[PDB]
Structure formats: C-alpha cells, structure tokens
C-alpha cells in the first residue's frame, strides 16, 4: 500500500501551530516523486537527506507534522532558529533529519473580516524542546502576584491570534507547513520508496 501523504498535504483543515498535528506513517511505500516534482511549494528544504535521492531509502518511521504560520515565520522552521514560533510553538533539533515544506495558503486561511481561528503561543517561561507540543491555556504570570486563572495586568492569556486578511503583505499571509521527520532506529524499516 502507498503512504497516505495525500491526507496530510491536501487536508482540508490545518492545525494551529501551538497545537501542531502529527501523522505517524508506517508500513507503506512512499512515492516522494509526488512532492519534489510539484511546482506548488514555495519552501522545500531538506536536512541530512537529499530530496531526489529519497526514493531509495528505508526508514523505521516517518512523521508528518503540519500547522499554519506566517510567511515571515517559515524561516524559523529550521535547525538552530529562534523566535516566537521556534521558541514557543514548534522546535526542530540541531541534528534534524528531514524536510520542511511550505506554501502560501492566503486563498484558504484568510477571511474578509479577518480569520482568527489560527493561534500561536506568545507567552512561555522557557523554550520548547525539539518536537515538544504545548497545548496549555494557563494564564501566564508576567509579574509578582499569582494569577489564579484570572486575566488582567501581568496575567495574560498565553495564546495570540493571527490576523489573516487577504490584504496582508506576503510575509503576513498564512502559510501551510508540513515537516517530514525521518527516523532510523534499531527496528524493522517499514517506510521505503520504489
């Protein structure tokens, strides 16, 4: 059977980056020719692997992580980056082995009055670890007094909304991102190419 990459790339709804979605891909033949022969991607950067030479490799597991961020922020989905997205939403390791794929989705993820269904984490005491997913909504304590789950001064809701409107500049328009992680453990390799 063929790997369900279509379910990830062509999904109707994408996740907010703070609650990024992960699809675990196993026991299937992966046809990567569908991806690198597509003229619909604006970002296609791979680390520790060649895209065209991917059909000749077997891996134990493949992970497909997907979410929506700003075009300004696609540069943060890479090893060794800092910023609100890399620090507090989605973090790649230094030794990352995989591919980061992105494309403009302003036609889908922006509404006339402004789309607010897409959120990102703005406040967090410390940086995320690689592949860490934080979905907490706890009120953030920016000062001395405890918040007790009530908003107010020095007590902020940790998530912020993107303002995706069609009139935004490219760097502020929504982009859908798919991160492929390639994992080679001391187990049977279940994801190969042709």
């Amino acid at each position, epitope marked *: 059977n063929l790997c369900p990459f279509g379910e990830v790339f062509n999904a109707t709804r994408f996740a907010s980056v703070y609650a990024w979605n992960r699809k675990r891909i196993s026991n299937c033949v992966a046809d990567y020719s569908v991806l690198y022969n597509s003229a619909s991607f604006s970002t296609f950067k791979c680390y520790g692997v060649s895209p065209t030479k991917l059909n000749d490799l077997c891996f134990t597991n493949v992970y497909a992580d997907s979410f929506v961020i700003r075009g300004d922020e696609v540069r943060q989905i890479a090893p060794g980056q800092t910023g609100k997205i890399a620090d507090y939403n989605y973090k790649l390791p230094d030794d990352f082995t995989g591919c980061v794929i992105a494309w403009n989705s302003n036609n889908l993820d922006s509404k006339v009055g402004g789309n607010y269904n897409y959120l990102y984490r703005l406040f967090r005491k410390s940086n995320l670890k690689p592949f860490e997913r934080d979905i907490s909504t706890e009120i953030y304590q920016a000062g001395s007094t405890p918040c007790n789950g009530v908003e107010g001064f020095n007590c902020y809701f940790p998530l912020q909304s993107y303002g995706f409107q069609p009139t*935004n500049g490219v760097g502020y328009q929504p982009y859908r991102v798919v991160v492929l992680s390639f994992e080679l453990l001391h187990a049977p390799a279940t994801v190969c190419g042709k």
Partner: antibody
Framework: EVQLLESGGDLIQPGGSLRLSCAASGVTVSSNYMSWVRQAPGKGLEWVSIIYPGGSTFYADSVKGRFTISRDNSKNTLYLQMHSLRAEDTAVYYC???????????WGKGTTVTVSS | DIVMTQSPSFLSASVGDRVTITCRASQGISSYLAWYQQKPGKAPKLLIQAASTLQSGVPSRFSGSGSGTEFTLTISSLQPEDFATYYCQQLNSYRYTFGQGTKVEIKR
C-alpha cells in the same frame, strides 16, 4: 508600584563602551519581553534590542554586533552593554516592557547617552 | 520591508476639537498597530494596541481604528493635556518600525 528605573548614561568618546542598567519593580524581567528603545535629540523613537522571556535576543540592524542585552534574575534588572559607540548612538535610552506584539506599556524615565569627540 | 508613513508632521487643533492622525503602511499589516503619546521630556505612553483596543486608563477621547493599509488615531474631544507628539508603531514585525510622529499644537 510598577516602575522601571534606568541608569548608567554618560558622556563618552567614540569607540568607548557603556553599560546601562534598568531595575524593575512590579514586573518580573525574566518573565517578560523586555526592550531598550532610544530617542536621539529632536528625533523619533527607535527600537534597539529585545530579550524574550525564554532568553532569545534580537537587535536592530543599526546596533547589531555592538550592543548586547542581558538580564539578572536575582536583581530583577535589565542591561544594555554597548561597545564601539558612535556619535549617532547619542540618545535618551528607555527600557520598556513589551506586552508581546511590540506594544510597550511600561516605560522607564530614560537615561541620557552622549557620544562625542 | 514595510515603511510606516505618518501624516501630518504637525497638526494645529483647539481644546475640544476632534483630531485625526493618519498612519499608512506600505502594505497590509492587518490590525498590527499601536499608538503612543509623548510629551516633552517624558517617556512615551501607550494609548491603543491592536489598532482598536484603548489601553486601560486612557480616557475615552482617544479612539483607534483602521485596517489593512490605512490606520487612524482619533481624539474625539481634545483636552489641554493632549497637546503632545503621537507615534504609530507596526506590531508583530521583526523591525519594530515606528512612524515619524505627529505633533499636535495649540491653534490660534
């Protein structure tokens, strides 16, 4: 109450070094987006540097490679270390708390830096 | 990058007037805009964030609105303490870009 008290501004020659301090009360520096913003005599506001609650730092292009922002948790204090100062660095320097998006609600009174030969 | 053009540089108004300051971005920034007020010798004061959220404690006079590429600060009824310089700032940007500032002065 809530206040930011900065100090360390002085008259210094070009190529000199200076450290500005910003002692905070009512706000926890390590838990906040904290920035330095400067204002040259008779000009507008210019953002200088920021340190995220998680520790990441970023700089304006005009000061990159010369200024360093840091903080001391035990002293609840923000710092701006300046090296290789130039005449155009002359300004009043404010420390400010950033609510997250760049909108700064808590400002200090400012400290004055003059760089001249 | 995105250039913030703030107009006018100088504005003369009278006590009780309705004042309109304009900040134009070189391309769409949604609602990512803040407004500041600064008086001579004092630190700036945050008035409105996110283009239409009056900061707590700021009097009801100050009104912020606008979306996309044209934004406005509106002082519905100018009071003596409102003669000052006002600054817009692009929010959620790598550059933290400020406008050039608008000085509101006493009409005669």
């Amino acid at each position: 109450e809530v206040q930011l008290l900065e100090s360390g501004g002085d008259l210094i020659q070009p190529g000199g070094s200076l450290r500005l301090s910003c002692a905070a009360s009512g706000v926890t520096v390590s838990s906040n987006y904290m920035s330095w913003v400067r204002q040259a005599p008779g000009k507008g506001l210019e953002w200088v540097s920021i340190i995220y609650p998680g520790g990441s730092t970023f700089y304006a292009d005009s000061v990159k490679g010369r200024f360093t922002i840091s903080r001391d948790n035990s002293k609840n204090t923000l710092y701006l270390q300046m090296h290789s100062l130039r005449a155009e660095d002359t300004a009043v320097y404010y420390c400010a708390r950033d609510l997250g998006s760049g909108d700064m609600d808590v400002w200090g009174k400012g400290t004055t830096v003059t760089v001249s030969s | 990058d995105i250039v913030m053009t703030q107009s006018p540089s100088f504005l003369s108004a009278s006590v009780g007037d309705r004042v309109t300051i304009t900040c134009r971005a070189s391309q769409g920034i949604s609602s990512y805009l803040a407004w500041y007020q600064q008086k001579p010798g004092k630190a700036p004061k945050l008035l409105i964030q996110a283009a239409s959220t009056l900061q707590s404690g700021v009097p009801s006079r100050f009104s912020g609105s606008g979306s996309g590429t044209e934004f406005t600060l509106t002082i519905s009824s100018l009071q003596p303490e409102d003669f000052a310089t006002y600054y817009c700032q692009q929010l959620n940007s790598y550059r933290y870009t400020f406008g050039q500032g608008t000085k509101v002065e006493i009409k005669r």
